[PDB]
Symmetry: C3
Subunit: 150 residues, 3 copies
């Protein structure tokens, strides 16, 4: 094997290898970034769902109180107390009880979280396919020993 | 010294061969990953729409019960306490029917939708080629 | 001009093969890590969807119960057209999402068990960060 041609078929292969190395290093970091975004969106959405749930339950508690205050219902009646306890159990889960029973609500999904859920997008990289490497020849030279025909 | 051509060509060809299998398998895998990502992102977008529809319909119901009670003169939505409840519903919001952002297909997908989850076929390590010389 | 030295060539070839095999093993491994993370993300979205369904039916069940209490209390008459639409909206949900135990009685079954709930609040994804492979340097086969 000729040295010149041999180190050419070696530099060619190596250059192709180095492109594949550089591109995969790159693509993997993109893929990692995309995952963090998707995962971030899911955590934001989970927060939004919790916030949504708590506000609906807080509302249920507030309606029973408004109706009681105006004497339309009496929360001491058995069936009404049961509904009230249902709301308190769900609120106890969140909020607090600041003694006076009142439940102070705290959102977990801030305005950035809300915006991310509403209009956030994702960095979606598309890999630029790599061209396969052409087959090589490699030139060969004659050993100086033995008969060389005319 | 002096490496035999024939043999050296075989080593180079074994090497280039495996390399091309790697360029090919990774070329494809990355497009599969890109696809699975798009599906995952579509599922999240569809779930967000479902969450919104679920929330809005419950708030629509709250507004509707308030108006029904007022209508039969049980409550007055302008009274301070009642108006606070009424304002919460307005703030969150067919008279009390909001069209769904998550359609039948959207609902089908978030509940039963499957994924194009490609499992990579491990490429074997390339054996050492012993060049004759 | 000159012939390629055997020992140098074998060297240059093993050197390339060594780097390529590192790439093969590392991509093999990374792709499995990527697949595992996809499954986790997908499972989490599925668990969140289930938690939303449970949240939904519990709120609708509450709506239905208040209507019954108000009716029993005679605050509302379910015969009126508007009150009947409210009742239909709550019954509607129970019928689709709960088991009819007879005579308008329903048993609510949750799709998101403990763990599903923990997973949702717990978070955590096996997020692998690839260790960059170094470019391979030029090997000069004895000569030139």
């Amino acid at each position: 094997a000729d040295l010149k041609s041999t180190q050419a078929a070696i530099d060619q292969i190596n250059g192709k290898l180095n492109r594949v190395i550089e591109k995969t290093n790159e693509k993997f970091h993109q893929i990692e970034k995309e995952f963090s975004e998707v995962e971030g969106r899911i955590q934001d959405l989970e927060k939004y769902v919790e916030d949504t749930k708590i506000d609906l339950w807080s509302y249920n508690a507030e309606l029973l109180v408004a109706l009681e205050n105006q004497h339309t219902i009496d929360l001491t009646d058995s069936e009404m107390n049961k509904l009230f306890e249902k709301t308190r159990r769900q609120l106890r889960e969140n909020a607090e009880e600041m003694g006076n029973g009142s439940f102070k609500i705290y959102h977990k999904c801030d305005n950035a979280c809300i915006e991310s859920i509403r209009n956030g997008t994702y960095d979606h990289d598309v890999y630029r396919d790599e061209a396969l490497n052409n087959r090589f020849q490699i030139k060969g030279v004659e050993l100086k020993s033995g008969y060389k025909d005319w």
